[PDB]
Amino acid sequence: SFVRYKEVYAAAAEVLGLILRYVMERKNILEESLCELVAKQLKQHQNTMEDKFIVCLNKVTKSFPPLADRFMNAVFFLLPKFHGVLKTLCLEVVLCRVEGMTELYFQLKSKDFVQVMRHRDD
Amino acid sequence: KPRGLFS
Amino acid sequence: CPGESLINPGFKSKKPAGGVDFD
Amino acid sequence: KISNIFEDVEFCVMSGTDSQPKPDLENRIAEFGGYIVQNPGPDTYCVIAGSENIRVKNIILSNKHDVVKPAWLLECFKTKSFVPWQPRFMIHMCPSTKEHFAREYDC
Amino acid sequence: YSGRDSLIFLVDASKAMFESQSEDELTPFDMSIQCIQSVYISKIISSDRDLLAVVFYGTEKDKNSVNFKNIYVLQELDNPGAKRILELDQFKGQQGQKRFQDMMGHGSDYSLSEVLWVCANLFSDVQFKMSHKRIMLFTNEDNPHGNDSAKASRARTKAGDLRDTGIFLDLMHLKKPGGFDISLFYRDIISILRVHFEESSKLEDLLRKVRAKETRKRALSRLKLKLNKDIVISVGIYNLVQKALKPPPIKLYRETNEPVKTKTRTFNTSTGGLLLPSDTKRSQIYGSRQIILEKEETEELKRFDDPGLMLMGFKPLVLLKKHHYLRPSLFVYPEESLVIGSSTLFSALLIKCLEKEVAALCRYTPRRNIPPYFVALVPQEEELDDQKIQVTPPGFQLVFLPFADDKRKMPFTEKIMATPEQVGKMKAIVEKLRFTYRSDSFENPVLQQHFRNLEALALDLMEPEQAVDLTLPKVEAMNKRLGSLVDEFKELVYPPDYNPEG
Amino acid sequence: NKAAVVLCMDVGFTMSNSIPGIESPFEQAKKVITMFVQRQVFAENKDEIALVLFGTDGTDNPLSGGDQYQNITVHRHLMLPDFDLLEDIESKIQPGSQQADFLDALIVSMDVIQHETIGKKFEKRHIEIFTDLSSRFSKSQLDIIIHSLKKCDISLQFFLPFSLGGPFRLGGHGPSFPLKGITEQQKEGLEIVKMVMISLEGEDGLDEIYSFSESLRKLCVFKKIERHSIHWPCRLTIGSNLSIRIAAYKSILQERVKKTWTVVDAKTLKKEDIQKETVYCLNDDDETEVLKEDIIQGFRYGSDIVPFSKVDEEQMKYKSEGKCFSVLGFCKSSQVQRRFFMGNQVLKVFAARDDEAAAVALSSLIHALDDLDMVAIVRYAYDKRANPQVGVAFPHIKHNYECLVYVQLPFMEDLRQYMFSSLKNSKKYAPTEAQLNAVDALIDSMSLAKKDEKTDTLEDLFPTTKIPNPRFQRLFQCLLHRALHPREPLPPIQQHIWNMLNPPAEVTTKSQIPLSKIKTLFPLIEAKK
Amino acid sequence: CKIPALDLLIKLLQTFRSSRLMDEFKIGELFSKFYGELALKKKIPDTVLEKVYELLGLLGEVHPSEMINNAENLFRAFLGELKTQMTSAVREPKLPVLAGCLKGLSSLLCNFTKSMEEDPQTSREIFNFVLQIDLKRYAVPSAGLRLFALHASQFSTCLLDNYVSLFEVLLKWCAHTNVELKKAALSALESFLKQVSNMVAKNAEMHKNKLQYFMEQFYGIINKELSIAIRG
DNA sequence: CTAATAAACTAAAAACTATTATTATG
DNA sequence: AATAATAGTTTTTAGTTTATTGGG
């Protein structure tokens, strides 16, 4: 939670997402309560501004897709707000959710996928 | 009551 | 919000002006 | 433009919403040469009256402009000729048309 | 700085909005119409900086990016201009709703998930720091989507997720001859009894146009009080009251409405060419000599002390005169940014000066280019209302002190006593004329007239709204509660033939 | 109307000799005359000022004759004060080895008044006397002078370096002379001054004597040629069946600068060479020129600015009646706070002057309102070009007259909702008791109030409202310097300005140790600028 | 007048530098336009927008007498503001952007004006002597060093004084980070050595400064210090 | 035998967020 | 390969314009 440097929560989200991919090495999940704690922290002072929010969501979802479901609308909401690499961060976040792929065509067209897909960045 | 250079 | 105007919450709730009323 | 008679006659377009929207009135008066201004300028002779506003009331208090109804300019336009002022649309006129009314008839 | 307020307005387009138990009462559509017009005017007067939107459902014709059928948006989140007011007043009135029905759809199926989606997208479109998420529906029946259980479930799931994202929906009680009951489809899909047959949702105040204006948590100035020379306290100086006036004349061209550049220029009378700053000397010709000087030392005489506060001492409040009052009182709040630990110190000094009733006289300099005046500091404690909400902030009420040359002379006045019967006469008069004080009941009628005139001319009304002159007594009840007291006191004091004038 | 004030100033070598460590009476008197004369010339006072000087080596008085009226030089007659007066105060005022009876100089300056009080209108004729009371003298004309003063209507004051009866300061709060260092000549002169003033004025004769130090920091220097501010002759109205004339006055009125800095040329030093114009030109299209009426005004309206000329507003705006002071109602005195005191002035209003029935009515107002603890709401309008205002009226009793004070009240638009937090809720910032006791010890050692013994009243060790604005003092200092020294830089800030600005530092010496207690007990970090 | 105005100013700048003396005489009208625009009593634009001074500095025109005369007024105003802001009497011994912009203006204008034919030379000299700190960017001191290097000869007979103080300030400026400071100090120093060499060659008091200031420092020197002594 | 005086009227300067080049590292 | 002044918004605001009485 401490933010004086990006590194703190960067490496922290690294290790916690790794936990989520390695709590009981995914052969079991009884510490899902811990995942609830980290999700509440995601709510805790990262559902207001939500800049490091997308970064930690990034790092945990690369190792653990099934968590961005609680923030789909959130990442849909904040996409127009962001314009830098944050856009790509959000895109990979929603990309991790093939399970979350139920219907996003209407979302992306409403979230104006057209501009970003026309927005040429490799 | 002032008077003069104090007036 | 209690004590806050519903038109502009965060701003104090406004009561109508009454002026002078002898009792 | 097409008819120079409506040129050189300046209108302070402020209120004309009776039967046709204001922008259409502006387009037609631009085509026919009547000059357009949005606030009382230095050569204001006539002011259109289409609705009652505080500003219209203040204009009524003054005696410099012609309380013109848009239907009158429509009649002048479709007849392709400016018609002399006669009272069937008129409330507060200018001293010159006081002279005009006097030389044609009484009030 | 804190975020803004997002006010979302959304009315149904059906026959229920267009009908009433008594059509003399304006239908739910039109009632929502005066509500939105009134809140638009109030926002223009008070907070004409946030963003307001208009959208419809139930209309068989839709217009939205998501292409959700029967979901038609009218106005994006926008500051209310005269354009929005006029384009909503055309449908205002029972004749206006017929025009609405003609040129705009009315009555068709729709899903709450659709409107939640489109409003979430619209909120996603904004690009400003945000604090308030307020959605204000307009409907007179709770069931229509509880009828479709799948629709109700998905709608409540979407609304719950939105309120998790802070999207705060407020129910509007709306008149319905069948009722607008709560706890049937409500109190479980709204974040916050009677069947709400009426339309009471504080709509009275929503129609109450507010002639108010205040900034959003704006800091006035923060200073640093030096105790003697080295020990310093960070303080936030603020006001609970500040003079307001009509906006200054916004100069614009009479032929384009374009603000014309107003550039002034001093130039040489000898040549006509522009005067450089060097070419101009400050002069005050005292006696027969013209004292020539410049600006830098002029302000160095205007300025005498650094921005801050220089304490003079402690003194009981009795050492001040009631007529002694220089400039209107301010409030001082502890500040814990420049100097941390001054909140404990502020509480300690507050309590201690409460005990001894000792005011903190201080040499005060707000900024540069300003003389250090003398100010009295009295502990202004926290006052809690019925709901324990602080109606008086805890801190110091700062009171300002004039100077010897800042007090004009008063010619000697006679103190000729009055008989106790006269005193009792006016005591009865005042007891009849007694009431409580509240500053929200007082205004400047000239300013109110200015506001109403500006509105009604911008609203293109045939007549301006009339300001109420609360600065004039009610002569009827006045003479009712005086009666014989006035002339009795007269004959007690004044000769009957001698009026106080002539 | 003019005032025929004259000065009978001691110039003897007695005061020219300074006591080591104590400012000389000669130099203090020079300080007083300089400050008075700069406040007089800069304000361009019309009251005529003259001057005679005793204790002077030369003698050029019209009352000569030997051993009386001699060693006395009249320098300036009754004309206007100027900067040449400053030059004479600084140059011609020199240590005068000769001494003379100050009574003879009194009679000389009275004859000067009679010489120059004629031919000019005068609402006041005056003399004063600078004297250390140590100059050689013989008390012969003192009662003759008292009679002559009674027969010529000339007022007086005697100044001493000695105090009438805190750190030692000149122009500040504290002692300015040894309390018992006055010589027996000074003591007998003080007795003579006391008897002269108790014969001339009355019980305020001791309220007649003052000193140089309090002169050097206060403005009573201008109290009896003073003319009060313009009154407000109007009529307070009571509903629709009562109305009484008033003569309002503004007791508290912050002083302004009398003259703005006129923008003269730097090549000819003339405003006439400084001609200015305002060019209304369209902010685009290479600044297309706009006629000064072709520019009109608009007003902000929500998301737009509507063109709205002032004429449309004024043709229907509710304008004030004019000079009207209409009461609205009454509220309890507990319902009004100093935070609601609007405006900068204090309307120390009075009823119809010279109307004793109005005085009786006003006394009834004061008594009944005080007994009811009750304030009045009155609508005020300065004139027709002044918008109406609401204000609070509460009684104000002085030892010599009862009166009513009217102060403007706020509107709803004036009020601002500025939210705060609860200081007492800060348990993390709860005041520790040892810190509280250290604060109490500081305040007791920092208190600026002394309970006046053998009385029931309390004093303040730093009375500031009775002191003028310090900025005008140094402002006039630099003004006179620049006038006399345009080539020289402006003079520094005078020490007496600090002395009047600083509080009694003895209280600071008391607070020293509790200051250490506070700084040791309270953690206060600082932020660098 | 904003970032677009800033970019416009620099674009016109680089336009004058690149394209010059082909139609860069249609600018006297524009010169006077900017002169009157800045002479506006309501002078709002930020100190960052004051690179106009370098724009007001002109070398692409043949310079008619008009801007030559206007330059004197420019100089008087600039020395006035330099005096105002250098002294801490304005609560600041600071000049945010004005100083370097004035440096560039005079660099482009003093080329053809104000040699040592007048007193106001040393008057404008007084300002650069104080050049204390520039907070990690160090633009103004190096800029002044360059400006002196351009018009060092315009300051002769008022730099034959304070041999040491100028010596050590040159040493410190050439011995400071932001190497542009170093090279500017070296250029100013070598121009200073040129002028002092010429004057002592024309001073009859040659032996005086010879045994006074040059010989002592040259012996005392023995990174670039020795090279600098070699040059001297 | 002409005369201050608030008042509304400008300027006008300062505080209030608020991003944003900038070394340091390579 | 990063952080740090830093101009861009409000907020009064001291001189300025009107005139309105108060003399003279």
Residue numbers in the entry:
A (entry chain S): 2308 to 2429
B (entry chain m): 293 to 299
C (entry chain M): 180 to 202
D (entry chain R): 654 to 760
E (entry chain T): 32 to 223, 229 to 538
F (entry chain L): 6 to 170, 181 to 544
G (entry chain S): 123 to 253, 259 to 349, 356 to 365
What does the study report here?
Recently, using cryo–electron microscopy (cryo-EM), we revealed that DNA-PK can exist as a dimer mediated by the C terminus of Ku80 allowing bridging of broken DNA ends. However, to understand whether the binding of PAXX and XLF to DNA-PK is mutually exclusive, we prepared a cryo-EM sample of DNA-PK, Lig4, XRCC4, PAXX, and XLF. (E) Cryo-EM map of the Ku80-mediated DNA-PK LR synaptic dimer with PAXX (cyan) and XLF (pink). Furthermore, we observed density corresponding to the P-KBM of PAXX bound to Ku70 and density for the X-KBM of XLF bound to Ku80 in agreement with the previous study. The binding of both KBM’s results in an opening of both vWA domains of Ku70 and Ku80 of similar amplitude shows that both proteins can bind simultaneously within this dimer. However, it is not clear from our data whether binding of PAXX to Ku aids the binding of XLF (or vice versa); however, the binding of one may provide structural stability and aid the binding of the second factor, which requires further investigation. We demonstrate that PAXX and XLF can bind simultaneously to Ku and that PAXX bridges the Ku80-mediated dimer of DNA-PK but cannot structurally substitute for XLF in the XLF-mediated DNA-PK dimer. The simultaneous binding of PAXX and XLF to the same Ku70/80 heterodimer may allow rapid and safe transition from one LR synaptic complex to the other without risk of dismantling the assembly.
